[PDB]
Design an enzyme around this catalytic site. Sequence first.
Site, PDB file in Angstrom:
ATOM      1  N   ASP A  52      -9.050   4.970   4.086  1.00  0.00           N
ATOM      2  CA  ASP A  52      -9.347   5.336   2.695  1.00  0.00           C
ATOM      3  C   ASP A  52     -10.739   5.902   2.409  1.00  0.00           C
ATOM      4  OD1 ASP A  52      -6.901   4.996   1.315  1.00  0.00           O
ATOM      5  OD2 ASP A  52      -7.184   2.813   1.267  1.00  0.00           O
TER       6      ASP A  52
ATOM      7  N   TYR B 146      -2.769   3.361  -4.822  1.00  0.00           N
ATOM      8  CA  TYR B 146      -3.239   1.991  -4.577  1.00  0.00           C
ATOM      9  C   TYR B 146      -4.263   1.568  -5.615  1.00  0.00           C
TER      10      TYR B 146
END
Lengths: 740, 740
Positions: free
Chosen positions: A352, A433
């Site tokens: 990420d 997310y």
Amino acid sequence: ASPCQITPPQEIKAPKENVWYGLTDDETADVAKWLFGRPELNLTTTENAGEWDNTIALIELHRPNKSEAIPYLDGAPTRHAHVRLNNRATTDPYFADILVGPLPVSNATTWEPLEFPYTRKTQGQVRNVEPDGETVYSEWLFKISASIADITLDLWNGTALGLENDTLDIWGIDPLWQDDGRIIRWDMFWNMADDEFDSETLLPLGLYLKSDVTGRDPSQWKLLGWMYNDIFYETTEEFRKAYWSPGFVKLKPNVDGAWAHTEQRGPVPPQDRKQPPVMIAPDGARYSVDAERKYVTWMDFSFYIAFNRDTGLSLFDIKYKGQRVLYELGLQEALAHYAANDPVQSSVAYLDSYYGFGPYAFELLKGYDCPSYASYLNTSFYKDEETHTHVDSLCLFEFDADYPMARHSTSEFVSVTKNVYFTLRSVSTIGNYDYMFSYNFHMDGTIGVEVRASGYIQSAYYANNQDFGYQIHDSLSGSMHDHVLNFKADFDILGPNNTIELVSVVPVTKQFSWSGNKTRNTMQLGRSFIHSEDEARLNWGFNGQTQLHVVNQDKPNKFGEPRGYRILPSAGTAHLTVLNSSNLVHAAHWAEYDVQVTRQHDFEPTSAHPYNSQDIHNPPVDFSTFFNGESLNQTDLVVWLNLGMHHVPHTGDLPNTVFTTAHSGVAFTPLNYLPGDPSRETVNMVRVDYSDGAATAVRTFGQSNETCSVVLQPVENELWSYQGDVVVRKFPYDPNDPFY
Amino acid sequence: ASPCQITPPQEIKAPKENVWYGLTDDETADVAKWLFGRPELNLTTTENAGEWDNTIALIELHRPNKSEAIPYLDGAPTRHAHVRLNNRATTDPYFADILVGPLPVSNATTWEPLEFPYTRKTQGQVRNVEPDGETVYSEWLFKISASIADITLDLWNGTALGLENDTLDIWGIDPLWQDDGRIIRWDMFWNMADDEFDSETLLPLGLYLKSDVTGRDPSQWKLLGWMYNDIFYETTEEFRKAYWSPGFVKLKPNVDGAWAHTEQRGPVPPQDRKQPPVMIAPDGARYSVDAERKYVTWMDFSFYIAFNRDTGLSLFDIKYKGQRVLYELGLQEALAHYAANDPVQSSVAYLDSYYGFGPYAFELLKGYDCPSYASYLNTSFYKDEETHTHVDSLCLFEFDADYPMARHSTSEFVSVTKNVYFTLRSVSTIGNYDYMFSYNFHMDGTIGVEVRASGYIQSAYYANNQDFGYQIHDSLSGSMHDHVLNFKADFDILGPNNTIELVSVVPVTKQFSWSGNKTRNTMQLGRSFIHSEDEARLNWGFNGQTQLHVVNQDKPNKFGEPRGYRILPSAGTAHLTVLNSSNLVHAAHWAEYDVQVTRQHDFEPTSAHPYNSQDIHNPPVDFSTFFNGESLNQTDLVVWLNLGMHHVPHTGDLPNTVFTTAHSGVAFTPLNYLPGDPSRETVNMVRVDYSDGAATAVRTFGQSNETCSVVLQPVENELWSYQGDVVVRKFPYDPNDPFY
Ligand SMILES: *[C@@H]1O[C@H](CO)[C@@H](O[C@@H]2O[C@H](CO)[C@@H](O[C@@H]3O[C@H](CO)[C@@H](O)[C@H](O[C@H]4O[C@H](CO)[C@@H](O)[C@H](O)[C@@H]4O)[C@@H]3O)[C@H](O)[C@H]2NC(C)=O)[C@H](O)[C@H]1NC(C)=O
Ligand SMILES: *[C@@H]1O[C@H](CO)[C@@H](O[C@@H]2O[C@H](CO)[C@@H](O[C@@H]3O[C@H](CO)[C@@H](O)[C@H](O[C@H]4O[C@H](CO)[C@@H](O)[C@H](O)[C@@H]4O)[C@@H]3O)[C@H](O)[C@H]2NC(C)=O)[C@H](O)[C@H]1NC(C)=O
Ligand SMILES: *[C@@H]1O[C@H](CO)[C@@H](O[C@@H]2O[C@H](CO)[C@@H](O)[C@H](O)[C@H]2NC(C)=O)[C@H](O)[C@H]1NC(C)=O
Ligand SMILES: *[C@@H]1O[C@H](CO)[C@@H](O[C@@H]2O[C@H](CO)[C@@H](O)[C@H](O)[C@H]2NC(C)=O)[C@H](O)[C@H]1NC(C)=O
Ligand SMILES: *[C@@H]1O[C@H](CO)[C@@H](O)[C@H](O)[C@H]1NC(C)=O
Ligand SMILES: *[C@@H]1O[C@H](CO)[C@@H](O)[C@H](O)[C@H]1NC(C)=O
Ligand SMILES: *[C@@H]1O[C@H](CO)[C@@H](O)[C@H](O)[C@H]1NC(C)=O
Ligand SMILES: *[C@@H]1O[C@H](CO)[C@@H](O)[C@H](O)[C@H]1NC(C)=O
Ligand SMILES: *[C@@H]1O[C@H](CO)[C@@H](O)[C@H](O)[C@H]1NC(C)=O
Ligand SMILES: *[C@@H]1O[C@H](CO)[C@@H](O)[C@H](O)[C@H]1NC(C)=O
Ligand SMILES: [Ca+2]
Ligand SMILES: [Ca+2]
Ligand SMILES: [Ca+2]
Ligand SMILES: [Ca+2]
Ligand SMILES: [Cu+2]
Ligand SMILES: [Cu+2]
């Protein structure tokens, strides 16, 4: 009945400058201007830039080496900028880490390659494996999709062509496949969500497309194949002939609907329209803050706040009772490793920090993400020659836990201590997310690091995916993935020279001096020190039988016991399931164990690099290479911790995963560190003595005996003042004209 | 600015009678009177009783069989009393489980032996291994201690003789040693705590005394030896000669002081005298209660409360959305298994239901043990022909968690759902331990069972105990022990016929239809059903890789997936370390695994019996015997769960252990049970749409928009109304003259 005084936090001044937080607006402006005035770099602004220019991907503070910081704190490092360039004026495009300094910008200011803090030694350069983001669509994917437009219409009443009428979307894997010089894509069609809903990751359609996209010339790219319903076709002609043949199995789409939306739905339960309990702060904030130096003190604790684009929030110089316990604590990377019977979901292994936590650390909803009385700090990040400020994206608050800290009752008296603790929180929402990070501090000296997950799952098409998840909707598989999030914990217990001790509870049959030639089946402590990096990669034991301590052998207590801190998984944890991942290769070696200890070096500040995904066979930071047999016996060590979860989404993950169960945490607690429990120093405890049906004494220990009143407004009122991201252009530097 | 209305819970009437809770006062009175009028039982009242009489140890409701209860609930069982007699009018004293009924007491009422719900088949009888509690002191221990009074004076300026001037105490092991017909004691001297402090378990002195106390004639008891500083002496003469010899090592006592007391101590931290945050309930209690039937409903949940002497709190007929998920959930036993280089601490293996959780479920401190706005129920227990009522010993409350239930952000809108949950709590303080039990219910359908520990540790003398703990004070070892607490979870998922499914996440190298003769290192789901009790005793996997589900294969959802509930250790757990414990023998076989599944039987209601400790080689309930190869494929199963901790107390356990870190919990969550997440049915969520620097819309979904005020009094005021234990004599039955 006077109103309660909800006083803000105390204004203090930190003892030292905050050498880690980030660049000031002016510095960031000066550096941008300077970089564009360097013709050798030949940079173009984002507004003028396309796909074949050289642009500034990042400008941030280069964090000073610990060897510079410690003498400044304990007895002021020259500031330098870390800059990243996206060089796409070339058929071999690349990212470039450089150092710009010294600051302030002057005639003395220079730039140079940065390779000190990376394990790969390539003058800070790594290839850019996705340089043609637009061309890959207009000159390839959409053209191929138009080749089967009649088929996508028959299958799902949709098309992806690059027009306004598009009802379908095309995207695939991260990282891209990197076997043997080639760069390969696997992509899938998705259904689009309705306007003003973010539900696309729940709408896979199940038609896959393999592409060799090696090089930047689309006339040299090749269509390696298609997949549908577990059948592979090498060419489009072969798929088209198969599709329109009699007997061909056509499978249904996932289409958006209330089921995929987050709005209220179903029967409102009894009494739910009444106000639920609400935490309030009668005396306001019982902590102190330096807003300019981003410095916090709470009770016996203090620390500095830092923030970057890659990993968002970080803590430095965390002290307890005036003594440092951690030089640095912070997120290092987040892994989302998937698996499936289809090639797209099989290949996804998100790292990420490529996208960055800092850019998506959006403003929090007050009263919901944190309590209403929390103090809220800002965070900003640089992108596109702009400083984006996320207003009220950090929160700070005390919270009276639903359970007390300690108690003890007898037939004659009862005593109890409240559990009042401090929290620093951030929430990053990277695409689908939502990661909520929380740093806890407690009156017993316990530091907590937690993550919870919510938001939308990245779904998988149901067809033939039985071995890799559940079917949770009409044509939907919940799929499966491991969350692994790495944290750097640079404990310097009573100084830098520390040792890891494993204290284990293990079974033994034992004879004793009082046993009389008999033995007893009992248990025992098993103690050992980790001597070297060769034996420093471990997992939490069977039956939680092994405790892990970070101690200082040269500073034992008066009983010969080394003083230190226990690290324990308070909320449970998990490392990557996949062994020798084909997706990752060398890109995330930190994901392979729960607890990993290495000797501190200034040339190993981070366990990852954002563009590890760009070259998985030779990443900038290969965590494996940290382990070269160095001694961890009373030297400066760093404990690298994974929080994580095995997530096989079920129907209850629709529309979103919930924070209650998607949870993982560790806790650092004193271990033979103090003479006793430090929570007993709080006034917020009580002792009731009692007999013959009434209390004879109530000792309240000098806490508040205040009677006051509060007016409770609905917190939703404040929601109307949600503004979001405040952008200020930094080249040309225009700080007086912010916008959105 | 009108005041908030803190309304109590709704008054409802449960659909059925509460067939489990306990005896009414009248019933308990009638049964006592009846028992004394049975000359065959030849019972004496406690007031008149000594050590050689027959007394009533317990009178309680015999809980009806599930086969009786289910048809009453789903389509009213005759009440019977369970009575226990302590028969000490004999040289072979014994405890006797009997049934008294039917109730109400009449001419039809009878008694008989009870052996149905025990695995030992001995007409409900088990020996009483400690029938001479007083004589063991006056005719043995104190006489032996007077033999070395000069020595105990020289060692610690103290004596234990049975006088007012006593400064020392003598006690030892539980269970007593039970090798080969003999009953053997190991005892130790302790220092006494100061007046009005409960710190004795921190004051061991380190002189041990082995005694053969077989039989009830003290002239046949023998002194098997002494131990001190890891040296054994067979006789008192040998010890006395050694003690007063030149060169003999005399070791220091632990003496009471502030260090062992719970009072505030040390530097009060910055701002701590200000009021910490406080949870308030603006609209009062958002749940419903039947006070007479001890029945609760909250949102989509409902359940009945039950309470006994042995295990305290229990829940029955837990339903969700009108459907039962658990027939029964409740504590079964608590183990405190110690180890040490000394014989007393080496031999301790407490099984707490012997002492009972119900008798020590004292009144809670309001505002500290639970929030101030909590509703508080009573609990009572029978002892000594008396009903003791613990006023406000259960609490019930909603709590707004410090983190939201769910969220998701985008560049255009943000949404969040609050995490408001319901808690039922009890706290039992058995001697030095404070166990706080909590049952949580959440808006996602998640049921939580938690325990935390505080209070005083049972200490160990420092001398030569290096392998079994830390030295944490001048002459004090923290020692070591395993907490293991067993819980019965009778899931009846969509009916009684259920199956346990293990869903595991495991690594694989795999070939695919789209792989092209290549393989990929990935992962996969591994599914299996537990077929039989032969394979039904398991532990939580390595790396949390195996999920455990309680499902109903005959009630799959529309996607072919069996509906059920995942059981997961949310707060971490641990089973007994010691293998084939010499202390326990057959007394606690449930402590040997984390998760254990057996087929339901009405003759196996409990995993333990209070007097398992009285006959460890042949206990009333031997949990091992539950496992006789019965099928667990779509039959009625019971999941037996251990919560637990490995506790090696350090200096921070002085004066008391803290609840923050002494924690263990499991959670039951829906798994493919509902079409989606049920938390989305709450109104207490919000969605902010935003653009151009302001919020365009704020949807609050019909929640409260109330503005109201509260006056906050100091909760300590209510502490003055602490009364404690309200005693009512039940034979002679005198309910109008309660006392303390
Ligand atoms: C300083 O920076 C500028 C850019 O900011 C840079 O000029 C750019 O050079 C790139 C090449 O490195 C140019 O991109 C090419 O443009 C031509 C003509 O428009 C295209 O035909 C090219 O694409 C084809 O050929 C490629 C292979 O050569 C294929 O890969 C591709 O698929 C196409 O078939 C390619 O896009 C870009 O247009 C210029 N931009 C400008 C404004 O001049 C300049 O070279 C830099 N200076 C120095 C000294 O390096
Ligand atoms: C109905 O119940 C009553 C009691 O409620 C019961 O009478 C009791 O019997 C016990 C014996 O079972 C008596 O206990 C003995 O008392 C004598 C005299 O006081 C003592 O000497 C005895 O102790 C010595 O001997 C024991 C061995 O026999 C040794 O173990 C011991 O260490 C001593 O050396 C013993 O304590 C008790 O005194 C009476 N109580 C009364 C009030 O009579 C009666 O027997 C029961 N009825 C029936 C039919 O069973
Ligand atoms: C590992 O580190 C410890 C440092 O404490 C070393 O042990 C100490 O060694 C010095 C002598 O150099 C002694 O005087 C101390 O008393 C020792 N302390 C303890 C607690 O043992 C140890 O020697 C180091 N190990 C190696 C292999 O060098
Ligand atoms: C274990 O239990 C299941 C009960 O569901 C049995 O499987 C079912 O068997 C019936 C026939 O008796 C079938 O019609 C169902 O379709 C089956 N369901 C499933 C999900 O398989 C199974 O046979 C039992 N096992 C044994 C050994 O008897
Ligand atoms: C979009 O327009 C094009 C061109 O007319 C057409 O081929 C296509 O079918 C349209 N898409 C949809 C979803 O109708
Ligand atoms: C956060 O930034 C905004 C926009 O620049 C500014 O108005 C506000 O003052 C900042 N917050 C604080 C606490 O200074
Ligand atoms: C990982 O797998 C690749 C190919 O599957 C293989 O070449 C390599 O040796 C493996 N690495 C390890 C450390 O086993
Ligand atoms: C208690 O009194 C007895 C009898 O006089 C004596 O032997 C003993 O030493 C006294 N205890 C203490 C602690 O002084
Ligand atoms: C608890 O018991 C006390 C004493 O019997 C009684 O006064 C009180 O009413 C009881 N509590 C409730 C809620 O009924
Ligand atoms: C447990 O230990 C005892 C004695 O130490 C032995 O007799 C017995 O066989 C053991 N039991 C098991 C199940 O191993
Ligand atoms: Ca190294
Ligand atoms: Ca360190
Ligand atoms: Ca059985
Ligand atoms: Ca069942
Ligand atoms: Cu997930
Ligand atoms: Cu303990």
